[PDB]
Design a binder for this molecule. Sequence first.
Ligand SMILES: CC(C)(COP(=O)(O)OP(=O)(O)OC[C@H]1O[C@@H](n2cnc3c(N)ncnc32)[C@H](O)[C@@H]1OP(=O)(O)O)[C@@H](O)C(=O)NCCC(=O)NCCSC(=O)C[C@@H](O)CC(=O)O
Ligand SMILES: O=C(O)CC(O)CC(=O)O
Ligand SMILES: [Mg+2]
Ligand SMILES: [Mg+2]
Lengths: 296, 296
Amino acid sequence: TLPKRVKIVEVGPRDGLQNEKNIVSTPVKIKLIDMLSEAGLSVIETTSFVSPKWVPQMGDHTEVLKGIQKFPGINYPVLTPNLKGFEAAVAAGAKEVVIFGAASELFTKKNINCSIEESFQRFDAILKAAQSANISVRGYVSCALGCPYEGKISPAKVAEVTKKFYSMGCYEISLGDTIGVGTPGIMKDMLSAVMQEVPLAALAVHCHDTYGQALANTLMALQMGVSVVDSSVAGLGGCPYAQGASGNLATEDLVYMLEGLGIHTGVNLQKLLEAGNFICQALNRKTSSKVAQATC
Amino acid sequence: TLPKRVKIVEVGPRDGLQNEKNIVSTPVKIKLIDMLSEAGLSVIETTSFVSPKWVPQMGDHTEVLKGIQKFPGINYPVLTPNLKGFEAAVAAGAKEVVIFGAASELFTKKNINCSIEESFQRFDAILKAAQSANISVRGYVSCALGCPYEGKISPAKVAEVTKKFYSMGCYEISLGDTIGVGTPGIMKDMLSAVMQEVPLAALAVHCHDTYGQALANTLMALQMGVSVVDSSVAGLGGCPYAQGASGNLATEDLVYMLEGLGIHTGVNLQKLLEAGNFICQALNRKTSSKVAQATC
Ligand SMILES: CC(C)(COP(=O)(O)OP(=O)(O)OC[C@H]1O[C@@H](n2cnc3c(N)ncnc32)[C@H](O)[C@@H]1OP(=O)(O)O)[C@@H](O)C(=O)NCCC(=O)NCCSC(=O)C[C@@H](O)CC(=O)O
Ligand SMILES: O=C(O)CC(O)CC(=O)O
Ligand SMILES: [Mg+2]
Ligand SMILES: [Mg+2]
């Protein structure tokens, strides 16, 4: 049955902003993160130390990590694609880093020319450098509920790659529905396989609402026992491998369900909707949070 | 657990259209229903024989029911408040009628003008005449998961009114979250008290997505046993009592879940999307269906 409390992992400033059409100034990014920190979130994905040549929406990763207020207890994990970035994150003050993989071969090759195993070496380097450095590492396993190339993905595979992630060092893995094509049935089947090899407390869910399935899939996870789920503020985000629809689950909409369920989150909805409205104006877009819409 | 098959009640032409700003021509409605019929739905709430005063978007109710094609095996229920409306439906050919109440006292006042027991008089009349004629009768219990005027609504109070409707002659009753403020836990409590008084086959759910909870509340109903749910085409409709936000559960996003769940619905999603695109343009709006947005 449902957990007494859930740790929400806010990805609005990295997963969300990275996949947004308009860009925002550094001071806006910092303001947004500061609002999210004050909103109550205990973990906020701050940026990604990635080569500006590739993803330029994150080019201010250095100045954004040193400019935000480090609230007591809150975590500000950053993405580090490679040793070089992980090196930049460290020297910039990061105390937890995130790495991303996939339970799909075609997806990995079309995004890094390396088979699913070839990708572990690279991560291995970071996980070795992070341990001696005493820095935590979170993992991402996309295509958990399906792939835009291979299509259906065997639960078995998702589990294999997650186990490899957990045993390799990651204290937590985010099983993500990158293209948002999963339905409660798949979430269940996928999670069942994973729980056999990886201890529940280390599991997280990252569902995109590309087809209106994010919340329902998330609920199924909670029923399975997962206690941590990712979400973007105003539903910011989006997937490059999915048409014009939406991206990440709307945090304001998740905490709403969680509160009706009497599940502790420690988040202040009102202060959160405020952060959502803020970033949305600075981005000249309309929120994708239904809760936010029913309040305006 | 989940049912093998689910009867989707399409309320786009009625619930969805009645709660929309821009009104439509009689021939558009007729084409929307005809298109829905082709999409595969087995029941399409056609219209409402109600005063053109209270709701004029439903004024063309007689000619509408008369002009729509009557696809074989597909039901076309119509709303009937007083006996005046019902005795006007049988004339127009109606084979099934929909009486509509609410567990909320304060709400009943504003919708059908009278109180709860004063609505049991009116309905008893309708259910009497309909039985000795073979005219099925469905009922709506608004505020099933709360009221916009009374706030919290008791699960037993909703079990009371549902029992009554079922004890008079309603072959089926639709419990609705008129303002979409429900969360899985509340749906589960409500459905529970109700299943004590009324059998499961006569139960249905009508969730609004104002707060983005509709599909999740629905899934709780499915896990609870219910096998017939209400939804509206392009997510047509709205919360007239709440801010200008989402209305009904998008029929397309619902069949997307059910199909991924391997549940039989009998609907051809491609044609459903077409009907959705048709009325959305007639209404000049954008679809609220996430699946439609992801489809192109
Ligand atoms: C007549 C009532 C008793 C009111 O009483 P009142 O108006 O005070 O006087 P009356 O003597 O009863 O007569 C009323 C006036 O109406 C005329 N009249 C009576 N019956 C009819 C009829 N069938 N068709 C046309 N006119 C009629 C009559 O000739 C007279 O008119 P004139 O020719 O002007 O002299 C009432 O039935 C009504 O008008 N109701 C309006 C309907 C409404 O608001 N429906 C919403 C859909 S439900 C939802 O969205 C939730 C669902 O989705 C679930 C979920 O998700 O939550
Ligand atoms: O969408 C995600 O969650 C992962 C990102 O696209 C990975 C990246 O660009 O580094
Ligand atoms: Mg993502
Ligand atoms: Mg309704």
